[PDB]
Design a protein around this nucleic acid. Sequence first.
DNA 1: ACTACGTAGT
DNA 2: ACTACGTAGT
Lengths: 150, 150
Amino acid sequence: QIIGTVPGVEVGDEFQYRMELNLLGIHRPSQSGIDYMKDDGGELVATSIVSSGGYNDVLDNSDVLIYTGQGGNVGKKEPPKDQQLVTGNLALKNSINKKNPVRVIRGIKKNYVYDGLYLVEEYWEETGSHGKLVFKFKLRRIPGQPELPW
Amino acid sequence: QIIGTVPGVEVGDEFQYRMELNLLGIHRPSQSGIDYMKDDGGELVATSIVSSGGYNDVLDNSDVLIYTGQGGNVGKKEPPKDQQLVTGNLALKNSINKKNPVRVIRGIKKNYVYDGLYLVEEYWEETGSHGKLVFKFKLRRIPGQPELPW
DNA sequence: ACTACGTAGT
DNA sequence: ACTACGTAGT
Ligand SMILES: [Mg+2]
Ligand SMILES: [Mg+2]
Ligand SMILES: [Mg+2]
Ligand SMILES: [Mg+2]
Ligand SMILES: [Mg+2]
Ligand SMILES: [Mg+2]
């Protein structure tokens, strides 16, 4: 697994299945929206995220993206509960301090497009109608990359 | 979807994922063990089955295979119930009379191998320890095809 | 064992 | 809506 640009993967490239992102090293998980690793000194850091309408996120053609954390049963669900600051959610949070590039794959209505590298600027806790905590991650697209239309 | 041999697919060919069987027209479903269609006169007929240890089936190097029907919660399960003679289970049963070739894909411990064409000779009802009905399909490998080792 | 922004078909 | 002999990762 790598952090940042993946060789042979261009901004704007389109993919049919999630497993292609696995083979090409873009996004290893099969379902999980967030992928991560441990760096020099076992601290979780995000490497790639996928926003395909599975949660609350609505994507516009801006440079700033709001990404919802995983868990708490929101989307394909089961009774609601608090989200946890572990694994992918934790990794995205640590990526704020480490200032590492995070790949972003957007789902299109074949089905996936690589939109380039982003930086996790911050995060916070929201309390939806459930009565439970959800995480929101504010990511900004690193300037210089090719633009993509929608 | 086709009945019988698929062009470019040889007996002994190996595949990594189920979706390859979908693309090459070997086995369209993503999880379901049985694939089927309606022929001239809307009667369900099986086209391909997959035996990858998901149920009770144990495969030897014989020409006769015993295939368990789907449903009734057996394998990845949820309370037990009777299996139903619908869809794939029904299609395999009708394939007995229609005497049509049925493709067989065996799972290996990359992960899938095409073992050739089979004929559904018969079927019957078993009553497991659940107290519920399960279907058993007796298939025989059509003579003449290349042999495969295990 | 459990999770998980999957995936096709009916 | 529901099903389903999936699939990777922890
Ligand atoms: Mg909001
Ligand atoms: Mg028996
Ligand atoms: Mg669908
Ligand atoms: Mg149906
Ligand atoms: Mg596994
Ligand atoms: Mg874990």
